[PDB]
């Protein structure tokens, strides 16, 4: 896509991407902070600590 | 549809699509977060963890 | 309407853009791999809520 800059302004695209990514990095770090599992600032335990087996992600586990 | 750019500005179309897809990605991620089943940040269990059978989607399951 | 950049200017802009996007993409992928190995992002069917796995004395914000 080197021809994109024949039509789409690269400076506008890059500045927009950088502003968007700064504020989105803020948003995603806030998503982590909002998560008890993922808030490194508060440092809660992971449920895997108290689990006797791997929870998996796509693994079809049953109670 | 390579001829669409003879009639519709591609820069406007692509910029609008990128803005709308950033907004829609935010909205869809918010929809997942608002769902207890789909909120990865809070990490609730899946109901399939507690079912003895596959619920299916179009499967005509009965109680 | 054309932006006015020549083919060579577009090519050098694209070289810089590929470098920026792909370097950020790879560093972010390594960061997400590190955060996933630290704590996988997706809970699994059992979930990863402390209330469902930790003892009753482990406080959970949920």
């Amino acid at each position: 896509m080197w021809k994109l800059w024949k039509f789409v302004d690269f400076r506008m695209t890059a500045v927009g991407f950088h502003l968007f990514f700064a504020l989105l990095a803020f948003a995603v770090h806030f998503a982590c902070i909002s998560s008890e599992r993922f808030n490194w600032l508060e440092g809660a335990p992971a449920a895997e600590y108290y689990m006797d087996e791997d929870p998996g992600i796509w693994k079809r586990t049953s109670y | 549809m390579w001829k669409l750019w003879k009639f519709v500005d591609f820069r406007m179309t692509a910029v609008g699509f990128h803005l709308f897809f950033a907004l829609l990605a935010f909205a869809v991620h918010f929809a997942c977060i608002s769902s207890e089943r789909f909120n990865w940040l809070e990490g609730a269990p899946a109901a399939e963890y507690y079912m003895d059978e596959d619920p299916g989607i179009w499967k005509r399951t009965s109680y | 309407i054309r932006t006015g950049l020549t083919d060579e200017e577009c090519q050098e802009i694209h070289e810089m853009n590929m470098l920026g996007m792909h370097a950020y993409w790879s560093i972010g992928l390594i960061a997400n791999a590190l955060a996933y190995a630290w704590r996988p992002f997706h809970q699994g069917r059992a979930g990863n809520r402390l209330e469902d796995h930790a003892p009753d004395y482990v406080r959970s914000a949920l």
Binding site: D9, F17, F21, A22, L23, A27, F30 | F26 | -
Partner: peptide, 29 residues
């Protein structure tokens, strides 16, 4: 939990505005 739950989407709105700002400025200029 906490106040980051809405901070995600406040920063998301800010990100959309910031990504559109060069677009709106280039359109304006």
């Amino acid at each position: 939990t906490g106040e980051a739950v809405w901070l995600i989407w406040f920063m998301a709105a800010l990100a959309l505005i910031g990504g559109a700002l060069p677009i709106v400025v280039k359109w304006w200029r």
